[PDB]
Amino acid sequence: GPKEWQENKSWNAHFTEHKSQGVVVLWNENKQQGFTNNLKRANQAFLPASTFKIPNSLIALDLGVVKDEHQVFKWDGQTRDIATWNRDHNLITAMKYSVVPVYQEFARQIGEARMSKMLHAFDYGNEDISGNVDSFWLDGGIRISATEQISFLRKLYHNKLHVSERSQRIVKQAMLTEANGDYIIRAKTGYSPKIGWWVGWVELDDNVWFFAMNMDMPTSDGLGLRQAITKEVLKQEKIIP
Amino acid sequence: GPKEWQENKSWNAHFTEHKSQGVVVLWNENKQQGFTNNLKRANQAFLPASTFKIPNSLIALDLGVVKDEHQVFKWDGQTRDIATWNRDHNLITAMKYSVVPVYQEFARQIGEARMSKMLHAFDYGNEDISGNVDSFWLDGGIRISATEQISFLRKLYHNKLHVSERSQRIVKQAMLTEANGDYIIRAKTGYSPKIGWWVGWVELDDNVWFFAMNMDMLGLRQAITKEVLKQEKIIP
Ligand SMILES: *C(=O)N1C[C@H](NOS(=O)(=O)O)CC[C@H]1C(=O)NOCCN
Ligand SMILES: *C(=O)N1C[C@H](NOS(=O)(=O)O)CC[C@H]1C(=O)NOCCN
Ligand SMILES: [Cl-]
Ligand SMILES: [Cl-]
Ligand SMILES: [Cl-]
User: Fold this and answer.
1) In a mutagenesis test of the A interface, which of B205, B207, B218, B222 is the best target, namely the one with the most A β-carbons within 10 Å?
2) How far apart (Å, rounded) are the C-alpha atoms in residues A157 and A202?
3) Where are the active-site residues found (chain B) (predicted)?
4) CB pairs under 8 A, 24+ apart, for B140-145?
5) What span, in angstroms and rounded, lies between the C-alpha atoms of B136 and A226?
6) Contact residues for A196 (Cβ-Cβ < 8 A; gap 6+)
7) Could you say which of B169, B178, B184 has the minimum Cβ distance to residue A169?
8) CA separation, residue A233 to residues A11, A12, A238 (Å)
C-alpha cells in the first residue's frame, strides 16, 4: 500500500537548473499524504534562522509582549545593513521585512524560561534554546527539520498550538505573503550561513498544501531561488497555475 | 484650517473613459482626510447589495450561526446561473464567489429581530431591514452611502464593532482579495439593479486607505477604483 511520504526525485531538476541542491517537502491536507524529492534531507534538522519568527510571534502575542499587530515598535536608531530595518515597524511589517532587532527584543522580553517552556509545548524541533535567548535560532543549538516544520505549521493552521486562538490567527495574518483569485500563500523565509528556508502553506478553495523547503546557499545571492524553486514544484504538481 | 474632505473631479475621467458615471471615496487613515470626485454622491444612500455580505458574515459568526471559516454549507442541489455557486462552500469561498443562497440561509437563521438589533448596534446605514429577511439588502429598505460604508469599515478594521474581536478577525480574513509585496486589499463587490459597488481598504506598510466606490451600471468596478488608486500614488 501507499506510503505516508512519497519520494519524487524529478524535483531535483528544479534545483539542478539553478546549480543548487535542497529539499522541498509538501503535505496534501485532504489526502493526508506527503511528497518530497529527498526523504533523508526532509528529516535533516537545521537552524531555523528567520523562520523562527513564526513561533517567536506566537509566544510574544500570547504573553502580551506584543499587544496586537498594530502596535508600533520604534526603530532603536541604530543604522543596520538592511535599509528596511531602519524604521518603525509593527508585527505585520516586522515579519514582512524580517526585522531581526525587533524580534530580538521580543525574545529578551519573553525570557529564556518562558521561551523554553513554550517551545516544549509546541514540540518545536529539538526544543534547545542553548545560546543567547536573543540569538539561539541564528547561532545557537536549536535545530528543526523540514518535516518538523510541516508538523508545526499544521498545528498552527488548525489552531492546535498551546497558545490562544487569537495569537494563532494574528500570526497567520502576519504570515500573509501573496494572494490572488487562484491561491493564498502564508509563509516565512529564512537564511543563515549556507542554508536558505521557505516554509508555509498554499490555501486553495477546497484544500491546503503545506510546504517546507531548504537549500544550500553558498552566498547571499540567489535568495529569490527559495520561492522560485518552491513555485516550480508547486506548478509541476498543479497546485498553482 | 485644512479640510477633512476634498473634491478631486479629475477622477471623472476614469469613469467617462468607460462611458460610465460614479463616485470613488478614499479615506487616508493616518491623515484623517477623505477625497472623492463627487461630494454629493459620496453621501447619497443606495442599496448595499452583496456588500451586505460583510455585516451578514459578522452577525452570523457572532451569533454562532456560522461556527468558523471552515464550516461547510452544502450545495442545495439547485443549479444556478453562476457556476461557482453550484458546489459546497465555506465562509472564505462563499465570500470570494459571492454565493447568494448561502447568505440567504444565514439571514433566515439570524432572523429579523437579531438582524435589526445588530444593524442598529453597527450604526449601519439607515439601519432599516424592511422587506424580506433574506433579500432586504438587494430589494428592501436598507440604504447606505459610500461615506457610511467607510465609517463602518474603519470600525471593522479597528475591531471596534460591537461583535466579538474574533468575528471581526474572521471576516477580515474572508475579505482578503489580493496581496503582494506592495499592498493588501480586503474588499467586497456588489451589484444591485443599476448600481455596482466595491468597498474595502488597501493596507500599506505604514498607512491604510479605505475606499468605497459606486457606479451606474463588472470588472470596471475594480479597474476604475485602481485607476484612482494609481493616480493618487497609493498602488504602483
Ligand atoms: C533570518 O533568516 N534573517 C533575517 C533576514 N531575513 O531575510 S529573509 O531570508 O529574506 O527572511 C535576513 C537574513 C537572516 C539573517 O541574516 N539574520 O541574521 C542577521 C542578524 N542581524
Ligand atoms: C450581490 O451584489 N450579488 C450577488 C453576486 N455578487 O457578485 S459581485 O457583484 O461580483 O460581488 C452577483 C450580483 C448580486 C446579485 O444578487 N445579483 O442578482 C440579482 C438577482 N436577485
Ligand atoms: Cl529572526
Ligand atoms: Cl448577498
Ligand atoms: Cl489574512
Assistant:
1) B205
2) 11
3) 50
4) B140/B47, B142/B47, B142/B48, B142/B52, B143/B45, B143/B46, B143/B47, B143/B48, B144/B45, B144/B46, B144/B48, B144/B51, B145/B42, B145/B43, B145/B44, B145/B45, B145/B46
5) 50
6) A22, A189, A190, A214, A215, A217, A222, A223, A225, A226
7) B169
8) 6, 10, 9
Resolution in A: 1.3
Q: Supply the angle between the helices B146-157 and B53-62 in degrees, to the nearest 10.
A: 40
Q: Which domains does chain B have, with CATH numbers?
A: 5-231 (3.40.710.10)
Which cell goes with A49? 534562522
Q: Are A152 and A55 in contact (CB under 8 A)?
A: yes
Q: Which residues of B touch A169 (CB under 8 A)?
A: 166, 169-170, 173
Q: In this structure, are residues B223 and B9 in contact, taking their beta carbons and an 8 Å threshold?
A: no
Identify the sign of the CA torsion A120, A126, A128, A132. Answer: negative
∠ Cα A225 A228 A231 (to 5°): 145
Instruction: Give residue A230's identity as a one-letter amino acid code.
Output: T
Provide the H-helix boundaries in A122-187.
136-139, 146-157, 165-174
Cβ atoms of B5 and B225 within 8 Å: the answer is no
Contacts of A37 (CB under 8 A, 6+ apart): A7, A8, A9, A10, A11, A12, A15, A23, A24, A233
